[PDB]
RNA sequence: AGGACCGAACCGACUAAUGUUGAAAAAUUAGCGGAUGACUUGUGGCUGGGGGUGAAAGGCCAAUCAAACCGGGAGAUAGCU
RNA sequence: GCUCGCCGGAAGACCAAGGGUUCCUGUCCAACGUUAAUCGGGGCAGGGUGAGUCGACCCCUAAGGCGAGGCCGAAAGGCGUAGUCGAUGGGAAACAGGUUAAUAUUCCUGUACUUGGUGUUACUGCGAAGGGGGGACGGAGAAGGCUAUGUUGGCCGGGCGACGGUUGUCCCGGUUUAAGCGUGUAGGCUGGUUUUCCAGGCAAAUCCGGAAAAUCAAGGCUGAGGCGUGAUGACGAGGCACUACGGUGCUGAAGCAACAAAUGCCCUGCUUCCAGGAAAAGCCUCUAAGCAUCAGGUAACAUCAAAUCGUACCCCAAACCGACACAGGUGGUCAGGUAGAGAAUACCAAGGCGCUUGAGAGAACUCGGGUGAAGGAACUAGGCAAAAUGGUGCCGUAACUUCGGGAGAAGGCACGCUGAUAUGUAGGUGAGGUCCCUCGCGGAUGGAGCUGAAAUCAGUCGAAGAUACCAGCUGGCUGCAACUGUUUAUUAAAAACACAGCACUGUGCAAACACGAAAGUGGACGUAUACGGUGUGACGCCUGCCCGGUGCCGGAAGGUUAAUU
């Protein structure tokens, strides 16, 4: 059985990484939300 | 030319292990701990200046730190750099 | 010519091929080529804006001269070639000054023939003139609609345009569709019909043949569910509706031309 | 030559038995279909929710689909238990 | 440690993705391991990853992304030019041997190569954001030449056998060697050289393209493999001494030939087909501005530099994706023997394993198998399941047919081993010798040696010779769908969907149409032999009547009728 998570570091970074977040206003809103919440890791980049 | 105090800072400590001793006795290499940002040329110059010994080449590798445990808190040791520098077959520190 | 295949397999029984012995067998002329990737029917939004397009064989683009404005320099036909990008054949011509160009191959044009463009060219197939100088009743192709813009009408294999009248600054054409149209008398036209008139006789013979040309399957509307098409739904085969496009516009007879900017040039509709 | 033929890899999934608090939230065993093509596959990319994509089954869109998931309006409303 | 069993196109060996210390050593057995545990991918401590040539980084681009100005948009933003990124593609260079407990093309030994910077010498027209060439490209097929590799012989070393025989036509083992350098071969492509001229390559050009003339027709380019060298080296069976029992130091024979042979290489080649098969740089060449015995360029020599990051380990799995040490999933590379067509299959090699609960007993019943008297579908919704058929060569094969098929129709015969034909044939390969020439990796001739089917005849054993594994059940009538395909991931694979073909209908190009408040984009760098929509669904014979209803198309006299006034 092929499962849904097929890891790939490049695609992970390009879709959910810090620089992909900072590209868009909504991405910066995500970062602001996660800073307000106090998350230890802001993004998958870490 | 590399300025003096950079040379004084690039070297940290000599590495002591049995592979290091084997290298010393077989290939006239000394193995030592260097700054994480030192370069082959800077190790070259510093070993030639602070031990007064001329060297052929430098080989460097970066040692990744071990993830360990201290009463169920995980903690990772820091990476460091290791230098294999070959003395010029006549000096014998 | 047209060749029927032998029925040595179910997918060969009905294939009819159009084979031209006189086309070049080698590679095309390198300096006049550039890539053209395929769209898949997707526009710059990424969405299918034209259905039924995708896949197919890779192709390179042969830069064809539709303008024909190297005036007054005779050229000789080197070879006919196969063009993936269109139904017609293209011909490689060499100009007297050392320039090489691709042109649409007209009917009856073979290697070694002489062609020329300009106001003073002779009345021969392949020759390009302003339609002021072309006699009425002549059949042309690669017809311009705005002077200096490039030929736009009668470019597909076996097509041509009839020059039916000249009155002042405009000539009246009869297009293949049957429509009478007016264009300015200074637009250029190439004499004679465009070649490869057997293109319409081919039979693809199998579904894969159509898949090679980039055509994807067409799903009938009456075979969908109501949520997908105005024709969907039914217990069994049910229609009971007026036929429409997937977007609800009636599709058997309803006219869709709406362009007042150009109605002045139309003499008669194709009827 | 061939959407040709027989048959491994490979891609599927027709029958039967087992399993059904499973070895497995879809498998195993014995057979079975295609196997130069409308084939199959790696890597990257694009299409975003009344939207996509669909050789069309209301299929699929992260074990979720006659309208995904997450958060909010929100303590919706509930002549019902 | 000995024996037994299992895989061996994998259950062995490398790598990519992914993981991140699981790698090696010492120590511990509380918890984890479906049991015990002295063991461990568990706990604790220490150790371990060495690069000018491998990869990234770097130069260059694809799809696509972002996008100065710009265009568009209530705002947010959307698109996009110049640009700039983006590999899964193009771009310089290293091999063999040795070594650690754990790394190695990285260390060591030996022998190489690449790029760039400086300096000297000699000779010189150098110069691009521009021009040209090149890079640079499909599918299938066929053959020839090779090698990897294997087998046998020769050679060398050892052996003479627990039970009849075994000094021989006997047994066991070894018989290896790279990149680089020189040679330019099998073979592929191409006429060459010199003048003169020219509406072309945004300007120029001596370069490319074109035209004419003269001259010689042999020059050039590419190219596996072989041979020589590398190599008086290394490696090498096996011996000699310690063993601290792990293994450690010294020595080291032979190291040839023939045959067979790839799916690998020549080969991005050649032939052929239509569905007509990336881009850009590195590279070569041409000049422009400009410079001008400066600079720059070519050659030789010397010298310097080649940074930084990855490098342990798993990698069809107990380390990745599956909540698990989960009968699942996971891209690429290597590819031995015997039989065989084979990468199927059976047994084995190298190598790796016995699947982390055992011990007994030999009830019903369940699961997976073997066999069965007589009968042979009587079972059952239904021959479901099972049984059966099954190979190669040759003979033979119906209706029907779109003339291809049907067809492996059906059905039948032969099949082991030994000898002879023939002390091994037909065939394949091919040494020596000979004779030539433009002399060579040459031509003709010769045939030793090696290898070697198939057939016929005669004998012979068994119940059985396609002996195992492997490997079509066949025929008749009929519905539906022409056919190959596709589908309800996870109860439906079908008669459903698609399909080639047919018809209707829209669309004259700033096309219709679709996405989008728009700008734009697709259709399409296409132009009615084209594109969209709808229905039908190969092919054959066909496709009848109705325009009252509802649509759609045309008409614009009359009636009614909006904003407006
Ligand atoms: Mg269509
Ligand atoms: Mg159709
Ligand atoms: Mg349906
Ligand atoms: Mg509807
Ligand atoms: Mg009905
Ligand atoms: Mg009805
Ligand atoms: Mg087939
Ligand atoms: Mg199976
Ligand atoms: Mg098959
Ligand atoms: Mg339904
Ligand atoms: Mg789902
Ligand atoms: Mg809803
Ligand atoms: Mg409320
Ligand atoms: Mg509530
Ligand atoms: Mg076995
Ligand atoms: Mg650990
Ligand atoms: Mg271990
Ligand atoms: Mg225990
Ligand atoms: Mg105990
Ligand atoms: Mg451990
Ligand atoms: Mg390194
Ligand atoms: Mg080194
Ligand atoms: Mg781009
Ligand atoms: Mg943009
Ligand atoms: Mg802007
Ligand atoms: Mg770039
Ligand atoms: Mg790459
Ligand atoms: Mg190792
Ligand atoms: Mg060989
Ligand atoms: Mg390794
Ligand atoms: Mg286990
Ligand atoms: Mg497993
Ligand atoms: Mg696989
Ligand atoms: Mg096998
Ligand atoms: Mg029993
Ligand atoms: Mg039985
Ligand atoms: Mg019986
Ligand atoms: Mg019996
Ligand atoms: Mg019965
Ligand atoms: Mg009964
Ligand atoms: Mg059965
Ligand atoms: Mg059976
Ligand atoms: Mg019936
Ligand atoms: Mg069918
Ligand atoms: Mg089928
Ligand atoms: Mg499926
Ligand atoms: Mg299903
Ligand atoms: Mg099923
Ligand atoms: Mg139908």
Nucleotide nearest to A9 (CA to C1'): E18
Q: Are C130 and C119 in contact (CB under 8 A)?
A: yes
Q: Are C120 and C50 in contact (CB under 8 A)?
A: no
- The Cα–Cα gap between C171 and C131 comes to 8
Q: What are phi and psi of B78, to 5 degrees?
A: -85, 150
Nucleotide nearest to C232 (CA to C1'): D56
Return the HEC string of A1-46: CCCCCCCCHHHHHHHHCHHHHCCCHHHHHHHHHHHHHCCCCCCCCC
- Please state whether A33 falls in left (phi above 0), alpha (psi between -120 and 50) or beta: alpha
CATH class of C1-113: mainly beta
Task: Report the structure determination method.
Answer: cryo-EM
Nucleotide nearest to C210 (CA to C1'): E500
Element (H, E) at B9: helix B4-10
Q: Are C171 and C159 in contact (CB under 8 A)?
A: no
Ligand 26: centre distance to CA A20 (Å): 20
The CATH number of the domain covering residues in B2-93: 3.30.70.330
Tell me the domain boundaries of chain C. Answer: 1-113, 117-194, 195-271
C-alpha distances (whole Å) from C19 to each of A2, C93, C108 are: 48, 22, 16
Q: Are B59 and B47 in contact (CB under 8 A)?
A: no
- The Cα–Cα gap between B78 and B68 comes to 11
- The Cα–Cα gap between C245 and A2 comes to 40
- The Cα–Cα gap between B2 and C124 comes to 82
Domain with residues C195-271, CATH architecture: Irregular (4.10)
Q: Are strands B67-70 and B55-63 parallel, antiparallel or unpaired?
A: unpaired
Q: Are C192 and C108 in contact (CB under 8 A)?
A: yes
- The Cα–Cα gap between C209 and C197 comes to 20
- Among residues C57, C104, C114, C106, the alpha carbon closest in space to that of C83 is found at C104
Residues 6+ apart with CB under 8 A from C145: C152, C153, C183, C187
Q: Are C244 and C253 in contact (CB under 8 A)?
A: no
Residues 6+ apart with CB under 8 A from C148: C67, C69
* Residue B32: exposure state from Cβ atoms within 10 A (0-12, 13-18, ≥19): buried
Q: For nucleic chain D, give residues with Cβ below 7 angstroms from it.
A: A 1, 3-6, 8, 10-11, 14-15; C 8-12, 42, 45-48, 51, 206-209, 211-212, 216-217, 219, 223-229
Subunits with 3+ Cβ pairs within 8 Å of A are: none
- The Cα–Cα gap between C189 and C177 comes to 18
Q: Report helix, strand and coil shares of chain C as percent, to nearest 5.
A: 5, 30, 65
Expressed in angstroms, the distance from the first to the final Cα of chain B is: 25
Residue B26, token pair as written in the block: 């077989």
Residues 6+ apart with CB under 8 A from C2: C16, C17, C18, C198, C201, C202
Residue A5, token pair as written in the block: 């998570």
Residue A20, token pair as written in the block: 């992909």
- The Cα–Cα gap between A29 and B70 comes to 37
Strand, helix or coil for residue C201: helix
- Provide the 10 A C-beta neighbour count for residue A43: 19
- The Cα–Cα gap between A44 and A25 comes to 19
- The Cα–Cα gap between C178 and C169 comes to 22
Q: Are C5 and C17 in contact (CB under 8 A)?
A: yes
Ligand 12: centre distance to CA A4 (Å): 27
- Among residues C184, C206, C155, the alpha carbon closest in space to that of C264 is found at C184
- The Cα–Cα gap between C215 and C174 comes to 31
Q: Are C188 and C151 in contact (CB under 8 A)?
A: yes
Residue C43, token pair as written in the block: 């526009």
- Among residues B87, B85, B79, B78, the alpha carbon closest in space to that of B60 is found at B85
Q: Are C231 and C246 in contact (CB under 8 A)?
A: no
- The Cα–Cα gap between C87 and C36 comes to 17
Q: Are C232 and C193 in contact (CB under 8 A)?
A: no
For each of the domains in chain A, give its residue range(s) and CATH number, in order of start: 1-46 (1.10.287.3980)
Ligand 6: centre distance to CA C217 (Å): 29
Rounded CA–C1' distance between C40 and E184, in angstroms: 52
Spell out a b/e string for B44-54, using b for 16 or more CB atoms within 10 Å of the CB, else e. Answer: bbbbeeeeebe
Ligand 14: centre distance to CA C37 (Å): 56
Q: What angle do CA C74, C75, C78 make, to 5 degrees?
A: 165
Q: Are C109 and C195 in contact (CB under 8 A)?
A: yes
- Among residues C99, C87, C92, the alpha carbon closest in space to that of C64 is found at C92
Rounded CA–C1' distance between B25 and E242, in angstroms: 24
Strand partners, C189: C129
> Taking the CA atoms of chain A, what radius of gyration do you get in angstroms?
12
Q: What are phi and psi of B8, to 5 degrees?
A: -65, -20
Which CA-bearing residue is nearest the C1' of E274? C19
Residue A12, token pair as written in the block: 């992970």
Rounded CA–C1' distance between A39 and E350, in angstroms: 56
Tokens 């995500």: give the residue: A30
Where on strand D do bases come within 7 A of a protein Cβ?
Answer: 1-4, 24, 26-27, 37-39, 43-48, 52-58, 62-63, 66-67
Nearest ligand to the C-alpha atom of residue C228: 4
- E-state strands within C108-230: 114-115, 128-130, 139-141, 143-144, 151-153, 161-167, 170-174, 180-184, 188-191
C-alpha distances (whole Å) from B20 to each of B14, B31, B50, C54, C127 are: 9, 6, 20, 64, 87
Ligand 10: centre distance to CA C240 (Å): 18
Q: What is the DSSP letter of C23?
A: B
Nearest ligand to the C-alpha atom of residue C244: 4
- Among residues C119, C118, C189, C188, the alpha carbon closest in space to that of C147 is found at C188
- E-state strands within chain B: 11-14, 29-34, 55-63, 67-70, 73-76, 80-87
Ligand 17: centre distance to CA B76 (Å): 21
- Among residues C242, C263, C241, C240, the alpha carbon closest in space to that of C251 is found at C242
- The Cα–Cα gap between C203 and C4 comes to 9
* Residue C102: exposure state from Cβ atoms within 10 A (0-12, 13-18, ≥19): buried
- The Cα–Cα gap between C109 and C217 comes to 37
Element (H, E) at B42: helix B40-50
Residues 6+ apart with CB under 8 A from C265: C181, C182, C183
- The Cα–Cα gap between C136 and C165 comes to 6
- Provide the 10 A C-beta neighbour count for residue A34: 15
- The Cα–Cα gap between C84 and B77 comes to 64
* Residue A40: exposure state from Cβ atoms within 10 A (0-12, 13-18, ≥19): exposed
């Amino acid at each position: 059985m092929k499962r849904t998570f097929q890891p790939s570091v490049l695609k992970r970074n390009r879709s959910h990484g810090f620089r992909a977040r900072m590209a868009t206003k909504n991405g910066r809103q995500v970062l602001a939300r996660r800073r307000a919440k106090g998350r230890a890791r802001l993004t998958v980049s870490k | 030319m590399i300025r003096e105090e950079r040379l004084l800072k690039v070297l940290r400590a000599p590495h002591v292990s049995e592979k290091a001793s084997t290298a010393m006795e077989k290939s006239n290499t000394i193995v030592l701990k260097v700054a994480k940002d030192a370069t082959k040329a800077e190790i070259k110059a510093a070993v030639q200046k602070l031990f007064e010994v001329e060297v052929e080449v430098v080989n460097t590798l970066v040692v990744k730190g071990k993830v360990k445990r201290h009463g169920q808190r995980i903690g990772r040791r820091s990476d460091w750099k290791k230098a294999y520098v070959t003395l010029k077959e006549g000096q014998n520190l | 010519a047209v060749v029927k295949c032998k029925p040595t397999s179910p997918g060969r029984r009905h294939v009819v091929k159009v084979v031209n012995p006189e086309l070049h067998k080698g590679k095309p002329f390198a300096p006049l080529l550039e890539k053209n990737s395929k769209s898949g029917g997707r526009n710059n939004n990424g969405r299918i804006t034209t259905r039924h397009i995708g896949g197919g064989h890779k192709q390179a683009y042969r830069i064809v001269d539709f303008k024909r404005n190297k005036d007054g320099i005779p050229a000789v036909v080197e070879r006919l070639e196969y063009d993936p990008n269109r139904s017609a054949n293209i011909a490689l011509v060499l100009y007297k000054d050392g320039e090489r160009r691709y042109i649409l191959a007209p009917k009856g044009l073979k290697a070694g023939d002489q062609i020329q463009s300009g106001v003073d060219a002779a009345i021969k197939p392949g020759n390009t003139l302003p339609m002021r100088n072309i006699p009425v009743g002549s059949t042309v192709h690669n017809v311009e609609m705005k002077p200096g813009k490039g030929g736009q009408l009668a470019r597909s294999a076996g097509t041509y345009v009839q020059i039916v009248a000249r009155d002042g600054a405009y000539v009246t054409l009869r297009l293949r569709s049957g429509e009478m149209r007016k264009v300015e008398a200074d637009c250029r036209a190439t004499l004679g019909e465009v070649g490869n008139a057997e293109h319409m006789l081919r039979v693809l013979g199998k579904a894969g043949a159509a898949r090679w040309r980039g055509v994807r399957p067409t799903v009938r509307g009456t075979a969908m569910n109501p949520v997908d098409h105005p024709h969907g739904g039914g217990e069994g085969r049910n229609f009971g509706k007026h036929p429409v496009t997937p977007w609800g516009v009636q599709t058997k007879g309803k006219k869709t031309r709406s362009n007042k900017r150009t109605d002045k040039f139309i003499v008669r509709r194709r009827s």
